[PDB]
Write a protein that holds these residues in place. Structure first.
Motif, PDB file in Angstrom:
ATOM      1  N   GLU A 168       0.823  -1.238   0.000  1.00 51.28           N
ATOM      2  CA  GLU A 168       0.000   0.000   0.000  1.00 51.28           C
ATOM      3  C   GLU A 168       0.841   1.264   0.000  1.00 51.28           C
ATOM      4  O   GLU A 168       0.485   2.257  -0.669  1.00 51.28           O
ATOM      5  CB  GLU A 168      -1.004  -0.001   1.157  1.00 51.28           C
ATOM      6  N   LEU A 201       1.998   1.517  -3.692  1.00 54.18           N
ATOM      7  CA  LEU A 201       0.866   2.058  -4.473  1.00 54.18           C
ATOM      8  C   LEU A 201       0.723   3.556  -4.257  1.00 54.18           C
ATOM      9  O   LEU A 201       0.481   4.304  -5.210  1.00 54.18           O
ATOM     10  CB  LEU A 201      -0.442   1.355  -4.115  1.00 54.18           C
ATOM     11  N   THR A 202       0.893   3.992  -3.008  1.00 55.76           N
ATOM     12  CA  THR A 202       0.759   5.394  -2.640  1.00 55.76           C
ATOM     13  C   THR A 202       1.858   6.187  -3.280  1.00 55.76           C
ATOM     14  O   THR A 202       1.616   7.261  -3.839  1.00 55.76           O
ATOM     15  CB  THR A 202       0.779   5.576  -1.092  1.00 55.76           C
ATOM     16  N   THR A 216       1.261   6.542  -6.989  1.00 54.77           N
ATOM     17  CA  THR A 216       0.227   7.534  -7.162  1.00 54.77           C
ATOM     18  C   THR A 216       0.788   8.936  -7.117  1.00 54.77           C
ATOM     19  O   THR A 216       0.374   9.783  -7.947  1.00 54.77           O
ATOM     20  CB  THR A 216      -0.912   7.292  -6.153  1.00 54.77           C
ATOM     21  N   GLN A 252      -6.381   5.810  -6.127  1.00 50.93           N
ATOM     22  CA  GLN A 252      -5.241   4.886  -6.351  1.00 50.93           C
ATOM     23  C   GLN A 252      -5.594   3.730  -7.274  1.00 50.93           C
ATOM     24  O   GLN A 252      -5.216   2.586  -7.014  1.00 50.93           O
ATOM     25  CB  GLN A 252      -4.724   4.365  -5.005  1.00 50.93           C
TER      26      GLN A 252
END
Length: 121
Positions: free
Chosen positions: A8, A11-12, A15, A66
């Motif tokens: 996560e 992914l962040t 983004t 996201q």
């Protein structure tokens, strides 16, 4: 799990980098031709022509949820913006020409973003 958290965080961070890529691409469209969806009120036949419409506002909604798991996904959507315009509009039009220019200028940005995504992970 801590493994889920670390995914996560990745992914962040992707983004964050895609937001900056998106801002840079959109500056290559000062006319704002690609800013918003094509209106079906104003081009009622649009979906007979174009099966997967795309625009920068729609990319931005997906980004902030996201919703891009990799750069390939984000590139597919950018390419739809260009490719859809070049099909619907003729070669002599301000719209088609704007798409060609966005594609050419966007290439530069995307070339370095691919290096940065590989480089950072």
């Amino acid at each position: 799990s801590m493994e889920q958290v670390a995914m996560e965080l990745r992914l962040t961070e992707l983004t964050r980098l895609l937001r900056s890529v998106l801002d840079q691409l959109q500056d290559k469209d000062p006319a704002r031709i690609f800013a918003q969806p094509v209106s079906l009120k104003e081009v009622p036949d649009y979906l007979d022509h174009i099966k997967h419409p795309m625009d920068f506002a729609t990319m931005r909604k997906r980004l902030e949820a996201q919703g891009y798991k990799n750069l390939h996904e984000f590139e597919e959507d950018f390419d739809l913006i260009i490719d859809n315009c070049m099909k619907y509009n003729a070669r002599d039009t301000v719209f088609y020409r704007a798409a060609v220019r966005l594609r050419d200028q966007g290439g530069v940005v995307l070339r370095q973003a691919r290096r940065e995504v590989d480089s950072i992970g």
